[model samples]
Target: KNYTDYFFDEPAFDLHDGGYVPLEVSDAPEKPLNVPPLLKPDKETATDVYYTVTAEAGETQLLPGAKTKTWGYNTSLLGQTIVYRRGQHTHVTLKNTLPELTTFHWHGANVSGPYVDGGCHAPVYPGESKHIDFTLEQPATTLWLHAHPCPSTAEQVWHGLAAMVIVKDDHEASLPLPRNYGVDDIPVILQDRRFHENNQWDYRADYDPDGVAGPTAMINGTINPYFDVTTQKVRLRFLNGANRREWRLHFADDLPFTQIGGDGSLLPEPVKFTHLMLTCAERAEVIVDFGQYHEGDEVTLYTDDVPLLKFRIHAFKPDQTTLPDKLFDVKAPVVDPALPVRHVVMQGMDEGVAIDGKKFAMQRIDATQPIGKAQYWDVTNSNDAPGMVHPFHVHGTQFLVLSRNGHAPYPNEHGFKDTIGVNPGETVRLLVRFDLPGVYMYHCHIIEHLDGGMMAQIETFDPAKPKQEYKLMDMDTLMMALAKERGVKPSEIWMGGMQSYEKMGMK
Candidate 1:
């Protein structure tokens, strides 16, 4: 199919917070790109599985001949990829051996809320370990696991704590997509960073109210990285793991490709494209055919004018693998027409960040809904002219995209989504379902905005089950932990000021 006439969303420019940092891949040495090893479970039975996932501190040679202090899950840097098959009772022993408190948040897994959801509320203090068990009920897709300690989440991720989580299913297994790991199928985690004294990251030095960013690219924590293309076609899973940056990717030669998936699920039909954009926490799975190059050639993937990944092709046997027209078949959730659509607004940034016309209070339950029910949600991005896109994210469940300003959704968003980019002056309507009963948080995917105030929680309760017990973190406890990291008195710690939603006259 010719992609030149494909229906694509018109580009949205985010000029907010001084726009984005320009990428400079020139400093990346021409070296063999390091492939991140996949993470394997500790033990597995026919009906149950166990994994000892840990967040720890270590050092890596990001720059040649120097050891840079880094954080990861069972590794020195970006951690290894996690593979989980569907219909299993999965048990995780989450451990935090970092110097400070941290929470192991599963960014896209369908599970119970609050503690098991691994949001800011579940803080495993330093030298602590917690056990969680849940069954897999979602489709095959690219998910992520990261740290989510309130306020300091962005900083902790900047130190590493992020990795790939792949949920496999029978339907996806039947497809002919690339299934080989570290070869034909690759996990491309997009990120950027800047080096400071002793190659250590100084979060305060790069802090921005909008979001923190470095001046260059770090694909899967590998600097100056590249892949040795050994096949005629390869599948690439792109994750926008940046704290704030939006990645607009395209091949150097403007070669067309087919996108097979989005967010947490596969698309109904493949969409061909020459360009793609992914906001924070968003994912796009695509297949690139190297028919444009020869065995001794090279191809580079770029964001604007800067190169992000280099591909060195080698002589390979002819591959006849072709992507099918249709992918996954998603069943529409039963929506109750009696339930009025819920309105949620993401307004302001930094000191004035808010949701639903108020600042986020960690202890407050802002809304309530019945479990086993589907609801319509209208999420509006109230940022005016000169403002940018807000990547909205919901915890616990993946919703189906229904419409955008009364029109149809973009081609890539036709599948199920847990996070989306809401452009300024646009209201994205979604059909959200709560499969299990628990308290969950929904907020802007921009980590700083989330920490400042733009987050809220919804409780999905079923009367049949007994009430669940949860011990949430208080502001004092949060401040004390953060202050300890700063070597300052808890009372002396200063979070940016907040201008109430009422003062902004936002609704």
Candidate 2:
């Protein structure tokens, strides 16, 4: 597709018309893809595994000769790729080495809410350390861990707090597919960034309530990247780690690849596709067969008209591996008939963002679902035009995509998903269940819009179980904490924040 036709959007919402500002290509020629080294555990025991993740700030050589200030887990740039097994009881010693407060949000992981889940409600102040433990009970798939400190999530993530997290299970391991990391299996952390003074990023300069995006595209921290395809089949685990931009991916030739999984679990069956669309925080696992290309052939992966990573094919030992017909067996839980169809409407953009026609109220619970029952959430995204994409994300548990405006879900969205994009005039229906009893959040995955106020929470309850009262964060308390960090007064900050706290009704 031509660049103009691809990036053009009629109704402008940031890059809604599909726009990108070309930057100076790397002075150094394209190199092998920057595959993040797997984060190894500090210790492993019979029943539990222990790991330490420090939120340290540093600079990375994104461009050959210059260092760009960034934040990451354990290391400097995009951080180490972390892997977890389905049954492992993992213990993490989280340390905040950075100067400000941050929360480690496990996006798409099924863990307890607020704190352990790492939402904005839980904050790890600077110089503090926290210990969190949770057993992996979700399916094997590609998820992510990133900062989620309320209003700062967009800025912190923009500064580089996103890391790829892989969950493995015997069911997926038994399937015939690529499993070797840094070899056949790889993590693709897709991001669009802009570099300013001394090759550094100024989050304030690029702040857009829609989503802060850059003119340059980077994958796993490499600007222009290519991977050596040394096997007959290479599995691409794509995590749309971008704060706001939606990645439209395809190949040089109309090469077809089979999608095996979504955000949370493996798909029921492999679905073939040549083009893929991933909104913020969404994940897709695809296996590309290079049998069509001989040794020395090159396959380029692209977003719109811009090339991302180049796959240099090489001679490989003959191996025959095919994915199973059925990859996962999961059914939406039975719904409670008494519960009416829940309606969630994503409206407003910029500083006027809202959910269900109301801005997020930190002290209020917008909706509720029974602790163990499943029900339909009819989510609609309404915006004026060039149809800005809003990725609806649910915390604590992964939901089943029941329908898109009453039709079957897109082929790539058949499996469980935590983040699903809703177009301007579209409504997405999902079968949601809360296995763990807690107060959870649901909001737009565009962290900026979320920080703007397109967010709300639901309390999952069960009459027979113990009555649980969650510690909710009111605006005054939250603004005070934020003020403490910003060294400002709480009054200086907050009406739903779609309009800066002062923009709303501040006197």
Candidate 3:
């Protein structure tokens, strides 16, 4: 009945021995000369689309004779890219073909939870599928989708099951930006992996629980991948999909790329920068100009010192296109003085993590904030250690970073973001609003801490409407439900509740 018993399976690896493997850059063919053409939206108005995603086993060759076993969405390794208009309804049909249970957590979508949020509360068992329909209420932004099933969330995500979901609004459509997909506009899902001798991944063997990292880097499912440039200006949707590694992305030769958007919304104006850094789950939209190079020239993208992807310039007519200085109209949420300020403290590590000094209790509304009311929440990371920054993310709404430790916000934190990094000993004041009436989650983006216990729930309700009814599931009840759905004993699911309950004398 122990939760650890369910995690007895050995993790997969990308190498024969338990060591690092360096990929040869010369082996990758001179960046494919021909790439997929850009796909533009059918219309400027809102659109609806349905997607069916299935988790299946797949193989990827990291080396000449090294094929690693991995899992992906719909196909093998990584899911499909879904594009939605800001005001359109996105109806997704998620199916889990794997022999386990998981939830589809939308990384950055401003929609109601227990559904669109895809937290543990919304789980799809093997041989079963669920339908989620919700309208995106945000501006143009680079969002991501991944697995979120408590303790196994990180493992499942590390095995693939993650992708990019872009939301475009009318405001963005008016801008002189690249609206195309695949070609001029592309989504880059950057991740690392290691393959074992038997062509399987051994995550447990190299697992740190705090953060599991591999030595090989892959972009959009291809090892040493590259994209053909057919346009003078190309927009790249970059997502740092790693479990723990922070990506310091920049082009070779110090090519300047204009950052037009952040996690959940476009910036008011493009910020020109040569180096960009992103922690886990952070996303950025950058426009790279191919006009600076000759037809046969190529540019490499790097993370830290490792080369991730390459772009080859091809023969294409120079289109006289200009990107507007302004991208999207992102208005900060107006904080009301009458609304009470909520304070949350993040602490602990590994086995001792806790949000507000307590673990996550499902169905328990830790705080109740009125719906449609804008409030300022002071999120303080009590950890005094250096280089400790937690990317705090909230579901069902996009919040603006008001201030960091009562000082000016960071350079890249000036956009509409769903996730903001709070440095150690710094109190981040965020102006948040709960438009959707539901129980949503707010947690650290460190992944491990989130799965460990640094998570809390808040219920948003309409003030005009009478006190609504809610079937808040307690910790034990939620765990029991999850275990039942997964065909395991209640104690077999390590959702950080047992240890938390024991520490609180609840069990």
Candidate 4:
């Protein structure tokens, strides 16, 4: 049976926000969808893979006239997609060519945090580079790479510093699915931007305390894009890379699609859906079959009433691949009954946002847990109805959804997920655990909320390993660096988080 009821209904949707920017149909000529090329490894041995990823500033022709000044990883726009093979030790030389300092955050990768996980504390200074190495142990799934600089993260991501990172494993490779990249399998990065005069984006001009948004939808960094469907079945890896917008995605004619994977791993069973919603920083891997459509037929993908992508179907042989009923087995760690449940309260909105009634202090560790210990984390959204849906995200680990408001988890929630959308006045319980030892951040992924201090950090430690001292990032140091980069005085350098710290008298 196909499930059609949506998770984010009425009040939880972004429609209630006063500053909501509803997506508008773009009249721009439809260009072919930009399939990000896979980044080739600099060197790869049997046991090791080496890569050099650089955050550089460049100009791309996003609109008709002037080129939009943007920043990306090794490209002019949304960078090349990076693929990681499980069991291979991966080494990456992170280069920062942008004008300001930025951290290269592996958004959903399970690795040591505060550095390799690349949270706010880890900064690759402008013109400098840092080397990180780790072997991925997680299952195959869709992950992402983005800029995670404190306070300025929203602005930087607005400048186009996001890319898709695919993890491959033997189990997923053996499945009967579309594995051909750029052909049947493609990355559908969902984003939005408001073009100003001369088609350039101004983040400050469009800033809102809740989240920054635009009226135009930009998928995979392409505006008014369309894809030529050449096969009977196509796999779309959807990533909500937008700063604020929640995409309620559905194809034309209410065509059904099979969701095979979630954020961090393949779902235990394939779930069929006619409607899917993805909040900020979440991912959904779905397979769409065009078997019913004839050649030259067009199908438009929409969010609300606005059309975002168009699919022009072509003739193709029937796809023999069939998604198995059981896709993956979620081997969740056993939770200790003696362990106390962790309570995480997400409170307030805008500059008033706080985790556990306090702003995020870079040097402060708000929580801690022993590595490899399974515990229940009850995360609650304190807002009432009609409030925004805050997509709660944690760094360095993917957790299994246990329950919501004391009810069973959603059907599609039966996988490893790093980010989950918590509605107003709702509490989500997750089976949380970490395998790596480091300081990791958990926050509302509405980029602006994160910058506004609706975030916190957790220290995971192994009893056997020696205690590691982390050089944390402070506002003073970040302000100085940002001031220097912007050619302004430290006192004059204003960012989104400054308002929260200032208004709450936390600084």
Candidate 5:
């Protein structure tokens, strides 16, 4: 069936939806900017490292007599930066001291779900601590962590529970890339939030099933932020932490920047571009050189006309560091013609949403793909018109984007990516390999669609070996747990649970 034939309400394409919103560029705010400190890896050996992250709430003074409630790791708001080497075991301890329950969802990591994925299935109540140990199996890339507690995922994230996580590999380490955190290298977590009176959060005020957004843009937990440039070349690890906004980012003077890496891993070669767009939960690592500017000059980075951050130039000796032609070695497995191609469909925009036209059933395994076997996936966006774009993302492995409607890939998408924006009337073919044996999610990157139920799961199994055991959490069980913890009735929890579930195709 032609999916576009079932047309729903359609809105004209806007530049903000494309990730770049132009507003009257403003000067950097004069108040003291509180940029989260860069986090470095705590390495005990070449192959192992230990990291600790606490999920706690605190107060921040954005203005006098106005205290905003915030959440972060090791810091007051947002959280500490997490750095890890490739092929190293990450021993992480997650402690939650908030008044409610929450979980850490690693947005782009190719790891086990529920627990390691930090989704709603692994909720840590107040004062509870959970330990998660896993090894890094993918190459270096930009990833992020945010709250994912069932119906409250959007609320906690909107309250400032988000941070950037960097994974570095030995292969990319050899390149002449900027390695210094904070000074030369900066992690930009771009997010938008609506503030209530006195600068407090009003989640219910702006809440929507699709996703909620506000007029204020926060960079690494700071508003009207600025950065001190101390090196010739500066690297920015950018992550779209917004609930629904996509960032169409470019420099003020249309200055070109070099993109070295993407959502899951490094690109095969650096691609230079003047304008870059990042969808929800996607990441891009770009390097900009400020050697040409004088000490007092300041460069502003903007999405359309909205000023995001300012880079202030400082006197520094120029280092003759040149990026290598090859950034990292990626053996993106070829699509095996012998394997059958898997077909999946995403439907709906708001009240109605589904995967393959069916609601999500916890006990039901939508499709079974063989583990460790490379195969091809055909994802089609049913929306009509030429500009309808849907951001498609898969879990457990980084796949190479083969084509978009049989055309050459997007200029900035020609790399190892776990997420790709599929244009309307286009079919995106990806060479997918599920090395991790478990259930993983694949869905629309439009925050609203994901929250509305336009998502599905695929189970990877070793056909030759016995299937590993897993305990699937059903709707009743999940509701009961929340009720017991919150001292509420199971029926009350179930009612709210069904609302969110139904919005996302969960019945």
Candidate 6:
């Protein structure tokens, strides 16, 4: 049966929040949708690929007026799409050309964390460059890359530092799906921004401790965009790269779509949906068939009645291709019996946000898990009803959604996911495991909340190896850098996370 509802709790939706920014239909003329060009490797071998990703600041003509200043990897706005082939050793030279320091976090990549995973500890300073190499081992799916510097991640992402990353494998390559780069297969990076005077984005003016949002929906860095549908069935890869907004997506005509993949990999079975919602940092891959529409007809995508992207139907050969009954097998491993189930509690909102009883400390590892051993983690959202829906995310590894509040997971959650939306007063049980040894973060994906301390880090270690030491980034050092870059004194600078620790007298 086709699902006609967004499984998320209704009362906890972002619409109920005091700072919710309802999307408005743009008055600007419709332009072609911006499909980020696939990044071409600088060098390539049989087993390895080499590329250079530069975090540079530039300007883009988003509106009809002055160009908006933005930051991205390789491009002016959102960076180019990066592709990873399974079993390939990828070496990337991360260069920081922006005015300040930033970290390149691979949002869902299965890699060693803290450093190679590109969290707060792995900052690339201005005019500096660093290199990292890792082999892809996970199944083919859609992931993303974004800035993850502590306290400033939300601000940086608001400046447009997020990009889509796609993984490919032989198994998924053999399936019947749309794999064309820009024609039929496209990445829809969902984001929203409020353009101020001179068509600039004032993050400080729009900042909310709970989250930042805008009234205009920006899809793939384009405003008022429409895509030319040249194929009967088009695969749309949706990534909620927004700072906090949860996209309650539905077509104007209530056209149904088939969801074939989620965060980390393809679903076990295709789930048909007339409506779908995506929280921050989550991704959904769906196929929309426009066979019934004739040439010159238009279909509009919306979020709570505001039109986002329009699809203009074009002439296409009448060809039918059906998705198979079964997609991918979810090979969930048994949890290690020796390890007790882990409990993580997300408490409060805004600057009062905390993972447990205390705020996040950079050098402190809140928990530890042995490498290669699976564990059950019960992550609970402590907010009452009518509160925000926290999108929980874990770095460095993908996990299985075993259950939600001791009940079966949503019909589309039977796949590997690195992020899940946790409703108020609910607990999401995740089957988590780390393949590599390092420090990784798990936190609320509402960027503002994460920066405000609703986050904690865990260490994944090899039992047979000696203890590992990571030179973590301290708050003082980060504060100094931020102040220096912004031309302000450290004591005068104000960051989102500073108040959470200061009020608690922890720093």
Cα lDDT of candidate 4 equals: 0.91
> How well does candidate 1 match the true structure in TM-score terms?
0.94
In angstroms, give how far residue 303 of model 4 lies from its true place: 0.7
Tens digits of per-residue lDDT for model 1, 1-507 = 535432323344542356566766645477766667877789888788889988899998887656789999999787888878789889899988887888888887888888899997898888889999988799889999998876667878889889999888889999988778888899999988888867778777787667777876888888888799988888899999998888878887788888898887999999888878888999999988887688889888887667888999988777787777789888989998899999999988765877998867778889988888899999999987657788899999999989999998887888998999998788999999888877899999887787667889998898687766657667788888868866789867644222223345532
Residue 324 lDDT, candidate 5, scale 0-100: 77
Model 2 steric clash total: 7
Tens digit per residue, CA lDDT, model 4, 438-477: 9999999999999988999999999888878888998788
In candidate 1, stretches whose alpha carbon ends up further than 4 angstroms from where it belongs are 1-12, 15-19, 464-469, 482-488, 493-507
RMSD (Å) of each candidate, 1 decimal: 2.8, 3.4, 7.8, 1.1, 5.0, 1.1
Error of 5 at 114 (Å): 4.1
Encode model 5's per-residue lDDT on 5-30: one tens digit a residue: 11111242334244333343333354
**Candidate 3 local lDDT, 1-507, one digit each (tens):** 111111101121112224324443434343342222222333334366666767776776555565767777766777766667767766677888886777888877877865667886777777888888887777778787788876557778878888777676777777778767766888787777766666567766656534556777767767677788888898888888876655667888888888888887888767777777776788888888777789889899987567878888888778787767666666776778877898999876545667887877665678888888899999987865433556788988888887877877755567888887666677989888888887788888766667666788887888888877755434565567667767789867754224444454633
The 0-to-1 C-alpha lDDT of every candidate, in the order given, reads: 0.82, 0.80, 0.71, 0.91, 0.72, 0.91
| TM-score for predicted model 2 compared with the true structure | 0.92
C-alpha lDDT (0 to 100) for residue 167 of candidate 5? 84
Error of 5 at 266 (Å): 1.5
- Predicted candidate 6 versus true structure: per-residue lDDT over 343-443, tens digit per residue: 99998987788888877788899999999999999999999988878999998889999999999999999999999999889999999989999999989
Report how far off residue 454 is in candidate 1 (Å): 1.3
- Candidates 3 and 4 compared by lDDT, better number: 4
